[PDB]
């Protein structure tokens, strides 16, 4: 667990119907919420990869060894039942562990996509801003909706707006 | 600037390695519970035996007259099915069934047994056709007159084929020691049978059994498989139901037992008695004895796989 | 300011996906090794057969006189147990046992066979009571005089119940062809038996066997199950141990074999021959053949689950 | 593995009998060691969650198919033994992998609770202090036992003591 | 300053929980496919039966004359092998084989049966040595003259050992009721056999079977195991192949069936019919029926375990 | 997934034949590529630990219950085949999941060794340099091949070169 989703981020954005991860800023020119494709998609393409593994085919045919209309001889009957139940326990165990294991990893890799997004944006901004600590970034140079869209698409200049925010 | 993640009003509780009942954004089912109550048989050559029993298709009671040479990818046995007109049963009957289920059908062939100094047209009112008849692939051998002896005959048949030949014979067990003689004359009757693989022998056992189909006598049905170029010989002296034709396995098939209708509208590969399991899911909680190409049976009714992240509301 | 984590002097070595013998702060056992050497039977209706054999409870030798109609949630077989007074054995004996173990006990019922023109009080010094006796649920049918013939009799019994009826009969194998005639007169003796499900027949086989319990003769014990409304018929002429009462399964139970005492002070659900396994652990390394509600047997003696973090000292 | 416990933290505090994680400061007013509930508890409640999964019941009864007092027929005897051993190998394999997998994750999630605690406290302190690099934080404004207890309970002001430490 | 990781031109595609066909730097195989086409038998006492059949080593046809008392850690059966000279077979033959495979070899011992008032040197041209001979461990008992009766004899043998004794006898099935009398006189022939564990009896069954090795008669081979201090008795009157010597299991071994050569140059522990699987890998895709100390069979041809990191080129 | 290898590091160094992880600097005195033992070794010793778990022995012998030269009776024949195939499916399932699970973790722990190396070197340098954001560190005090080799072996002084880089 990477400590982000249900970590230092106390809630989730139910207003975000556009994707899995996104940015919500607050400058002067009003307000707006967005969405992040490359973070949303990479996590989506990984969960999708899990179902494609789960759903699988077998050319492994199985036949009858029992008879429902005419009960087989008891001795062989019980050996067959005993064996079938033994295998049933194995598959019930396997199925439970698989899902538990997969779910644990699914959640963690999703939380590991939040932190992976975060820290890279934190790297774009250099010393031109500082970590608020609760998933937010406190800037000391006012950025606009033309400049905000330049951070969303990884084009913000990590220096050509720095010296101004340095004094502050 | 602030970043975050999506969330929903009502999420889905799943279970993890460490938790139980943790809500996620979205989840999918892993265990199949939806059954279709018909035999999905689209694209397959199907044979519904109905009243005919699987073992009947070899001996040929009236029910199985239309199944003496069937051919199938899929074979369906029915509860009303029956291997028998004149009361009796098969020794090693379930092994024989499992053989026939995956046989892809059967092909019959005359063995060509000829009979001198005996009778041949033994029949019964348990096997009705025009009137009293008998098994179509068998022959009720008998003494010439309404009593007298039965010559120690000996018939033989060589499998000239490339495939194993299903041979089947029958031992008649008369109601009494009186009835046994009236049919085959007095004395200890002995039917011996051998091959380059098989080794056995049979004695009748007269005596009163309860009436089934109206009869107190029984017919033991026995069988062996004849390998290519191997020969089988029937040393007998009475109380003996002779094989008329042998059988050969056509190819490959699957056999199921069911009580639901056939549906050529849907395609199945995993079957059970209550219908067809069509699913891509790895597991199922429907029938532990389902056969064919099936998901694994599990005890659990439901196992939800998380297809989303943690779900936390404000 | 500085932050850190706890640690201990002596930690616990565990194994991981990548390591082997890594010390953690705390760990717990996963494989059960602690056995209690008694049959924990608290809250269950228990029946210790002791000297009585399970199959004896149907035939009724003196040992099983107190078990002819038992009733249990839990059945314990004992090594000293015995199904027999007069030497002999059951055909398909182990299937019958597995039936009786989960039967929840048995209920007897008179079949009401009546006998004219024969004897009925056959006994032996192998079955002692007052003096020489016999199986309590069976009857040693015999010729009227100290020789002579045995009429071809025929008895029948219909299961008027809603449950299958356990029928059991016996074939006496005399010491010689002299002894067989002295008991049932000369000639080939034949016991035939049938139902709407069953089909068989039996001949005695006189000859010298070694002495068990003081006797050289043997008694073959055979059995079949009668379905509701189905009828069974016994066509016989001698060498035959007649059934006096039939049996019905009370309900459900479990059967074990053990050599340790019963303890109504502890509750068990997983049993084996050396006692009871009381544990919540998923696995066990005690007895691979343990039965009941048990953890899975594993070869490993110990598998430690980490219940703490890495343990690093200064 | 998150690289903390047995990572950039070379030892563990055997003196810490109060909890799993805690703080050990060093200002002027003496010395003291503490403990952190929310970090200790969240990790404890996760390990506890693992045993509750391990310990589980089955209404799956199994019967005899063997006989110890009277050996069954050899052919069926060997088929039964062969089957029992086959299942025994499966369960021995399952048990070994489960524990190995769980232990790997148990350790890692514990190490992932150290790093999760750390980085959040590092966020509280803003630029008012800097990472020593070995699990310690070098402050350039002297904090007291009344102020230290304000960092332990997440109440320290991330600004109202800043400007002083800025010059230093 | 900048830091990074290594990479390669051509990497290895592996599969993960979430991906399929992801290239890593290096990977290793987990499923074994490399077979060695010989029986690696270094360090083991090996016995190649060749033409001798495993069951032959008890009865002793000419092929098995050099195997009447063998001793092995490893036993190899061969396709050309045969348990028989005079045509016949064993009842419960496969159980007996599985017993002999793990027996560690056999030790013979005279049972000491003596014969008065009969013949003893029965032979056949199916068992050649000097000329016509018989099974070396058996004895073809016969009537004194070229006809006449056969006295109701009775032989007994007590296992004075600490180990179970393998007893084996034979029932001769003559070509006809004429041949049976010419050998053992007229009348119903009966061979009875019992112990403190066993209970059975045998009748011959004359009649024409096809010719195998030049003969139409057959020999049923039967067997039982005698516990220490337990006694076995043979009540018979003809049609009977007497045991001359009993057998004892030396210790422990393993038995395989193969068609490839023996190689004392390599050491094996997992065998199959096409050779030896030498591997440390946990799984294998060679033979599902491989026996010994083997990796688990899997359907997959290959399962690559990543032994490196993600591989990303410029 | 820790987001480093195939994360904020777009490529791998095919020129690095010396180890798994290393440093590639660029000052004035020319150029040079290195390798890092303790990072390479710890990851290597973990992968090595995985194969030693995979390769394992069994004193679990299995015998014949079938017969290839003489087919057993059909009923027991099919029960045996049915059982063998049932176990075959279990082992094929186990083998596939094991490898998939192990491979997932192998990759992730390798990526978790990159990030573990990175952040510790970032801690050595204190405020004397700043994160470029793409796996590189921008220094504002020129370091030499005698000084570079002092960062490689964890001996660089996190202060005695600071004040100079502070103004810059
Ligand atoms: C009290 C009295 O006189 N009653 C007779 C009554 O016997 C008779 O019924 C017949 O009963 C006999 C047995 O006694 C058989 O059951 C006869 O049935 C058939 C059958 O259909 O199977 C007739 C058939 O011709 C026979 N076939 C051959 C080849 O033998 C079979 C055969 O014997 C048995 O199946 C073998 O056990 O029996 C049945 O006609 C009635 C009618 O005749 O008349 C009363 O007077
Ligand atoms: C050399 C000599 O004269 N010895 C006799 C000796 O035979 C006799 O012992 C009796 O031996 C006979 C066999 O010869 C039986 O074993 C008798 O045993 C019983 C039994 O207890 O089972 C007596 C009983 O009355 C019989 N019951 C019935 C219904 O027949 C059974 C029964 O026959 C067998 O169990 C069936 O095989 O046999 C036994 O008394 C002794 C004592 O009489 O005297 C010597 O002179
Ligand atoms: C038309 C004619 O006259 N042909 C005879 C012909 O019978 C005879 O061959 C012999 O054929 C008899 C059966 O009729 C047996 O098959 C004889 O074979 C042996 C054998 O080798 O096994 C001889 C041996 O001595 C016998 N051993 C004993 C102890 O009996 C066995 C034995 O009977 C059988 O194995 C049991 O079924 O039979 C065989 O010689 C030939 C040659 O004599 O001559 C023709 O005139
Ligand atoms: C085997 O199990 C079935 C249900 O799956 C049960 O109905 C049947 O009685 C059992 N067979 C025997 C012989 O006990
Ligand atoms: C819920 O889960 C399934 C599986 O991923 C998916 O097909 C479906 O679209 C999901 N619902 C949402 C919220 O998209
Ligand atoms: C069987 O025998 C015939 C005799 O003509 C022979 O031609 C044929 O090759 C044989 N078939 C087999 C199965 O080898
Ligand atoms: C050791 O482990 C068990 C399982 O978590 C726990 O009950 C016990 O209290 C532990 N000991 C300590 C140090 O608390
Ligand atoms: C059995 O037969 C009786 C005859 O009276 C009938 O009343 C009853 O319904 C039948 N029982 C069953 C099992 O259907
Ligand atoms: C089966 O295994 C048991 C021990 O579990 C052994 O004592 C017995 O001999 C085996 N059964 C047979 C028939 O080999
Ligand atoms: C490839 O993988 C195996 C297993 O780790 C290893 O022995 C071999 O040396 C590897 N090749 C390289 C690049 O070292
Ligand atoms: C078997 O009987 C003999 C008789 O002398 C006795 O000495 C020996 O102890 C017995 N052996 C066993 C297996 O107890
Ligand atoms: C069991 O499987 C084998 C192949 O593994 C097959 O050749 C054989 O026919 C099968 N046995 C039976 C009795 O169907």
* Helical content of chain A (DSSP H or I, runs of 4+): 40-55%
- The gyration radius over C-alpha positions of chain B equals 28 Å
Report the span from N to C terminus of chain B: 19 Å
Biggest sheet statistics of chain B = 5 strands, mixed
N-to-C CA distance of chain A: 35 Å
Summed up, the helix count of chain A is 4
User: Helix/strand-derived class of chain A?
Assistant: mainly alpha
Beta content of chain B: 35-45%
Structural class of chain B: mainly beta
Percent helix of chain B: under 10%
Major sheet details of chain A: 2 strands, antiparallel
Classified by CATH, the class of chain A is Alpha Beta
The CATH architecture classification of the largest domain in chain B is Alpha-Beta Complex
Largest interface: A-B, 71 and 60 residues
Helix-strand topology string of chain A: EEHHEEHH
CATH C-level label of the largest domain in chain B = Alpha Beta
CATH architecture level-2 label of chain A: Alpha-Beta Complex
- Taking Cα atoms only, what radius of gyration of chain A do you get, to the nearest Å? 27 Å
Alpha plus pi helix count of chain B: 3
Total tally of structural domains of chain A: 1
Which outline of chain A best applies?
A: rod-shaped
């Amino acid at each position: 667990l990477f400590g982000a989703i249900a970590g230092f981020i106390e809630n989730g954005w139910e207003g975000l119907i556009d994707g899995w991860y996104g940015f919500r800023h607050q400058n002067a020119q009003g307000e707006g919420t967005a969405a992040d494709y490359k973070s949303t998609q990479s996590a989506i393409d990984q969960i999708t990869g899990k179902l494609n593994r789960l759903i699988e085919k077998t050319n492994q045919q199985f036949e009858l060894i029992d008879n429902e209309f005419n009960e087989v001889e008891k001795q062989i009957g019980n050996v067959i039942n005993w064996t079938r139940d033994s295998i049933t326990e194995v598959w019930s165990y396997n199925a439970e562990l698989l899902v538990a294991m997969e779910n644990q990893h699914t959640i963690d890799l999703a939380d590991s996509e939040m932190d992976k997004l975060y820290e890279r944006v934190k790297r774009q901004l250099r010393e031109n801003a500082e970590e608020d600590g609760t998933g937010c970034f406190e800037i000391f140079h006012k950025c606009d909706d033309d400049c905000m869209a330049s951070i969303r698409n990884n084009t913000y200049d990590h220096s050509k707006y720095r010296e101004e925010a340095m004094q502050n | 600037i602030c970043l975050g993640h999506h969330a929903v009003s009502n999420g889905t509780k799943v279970n993890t390695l460490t938790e139980r009942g943790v809500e996620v954004v979205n989840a999918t089912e892993t265990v199949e519970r939806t059954n279709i109550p018909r035999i999905c048989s689209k694209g397959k050559r199907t044979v519904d035996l109905g009243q005919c029993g699987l073992l009947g298709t070899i001996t040929g009671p009236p029910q199985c007259d239309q199944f003496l040479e069937f051919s199938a990818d899929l074979i369906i046995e029915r509860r009303e099915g029956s291997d028998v007109c004149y009361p009796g049963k098969f020794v090693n009957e379930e092994a024989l069934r499992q053989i026939l289920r995956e046989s892809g059908g059967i092909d019959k062939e005359a063995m060509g047994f000829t009979y001198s100094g005996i009778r041949t047209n033994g029949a019964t009112s348990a096997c009705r056709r025009s009137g009293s008849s008998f098994y179509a692939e068998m022959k009720w051998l008998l003494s010439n007159t309404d009593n007298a002896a039965f010559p120690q005959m000996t018939k033989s048949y060589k499998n000239t084929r490339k495939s194993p030949a299903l041979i089947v014979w029958g031992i008649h067990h008369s109601v009494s020691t009186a009835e046994q003689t009236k049919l085959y004359g007095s004395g200890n009757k002995l039917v011996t049978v051998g091959s380059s693989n098989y080794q056995q022998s049979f004695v009748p056992s007269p005596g009163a059994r309860p009436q089934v189909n109206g009869q107190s006598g029984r017919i033991d049905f026995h069988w062996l498989m004849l390998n290519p170029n191997d020969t089988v010989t029937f040393s007998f002296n009475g109380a003996f139901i002779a094989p008329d034709r042998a059988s050969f396995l056509r190819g490959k098939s699957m056999g199921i037992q069911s009580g639901v209708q056939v549906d050529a509208n849907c395609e199945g590969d995993c079957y059970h008695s209550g219908g067809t399991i069509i699913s891509n899911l790895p597991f199922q909680n429907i029938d532990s004895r389902a056969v064919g190409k099936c998901p694994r049976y599990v005890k659990q009714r439901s196992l939800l796989l998380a297809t989303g992240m943690k779900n936390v509301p404000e």
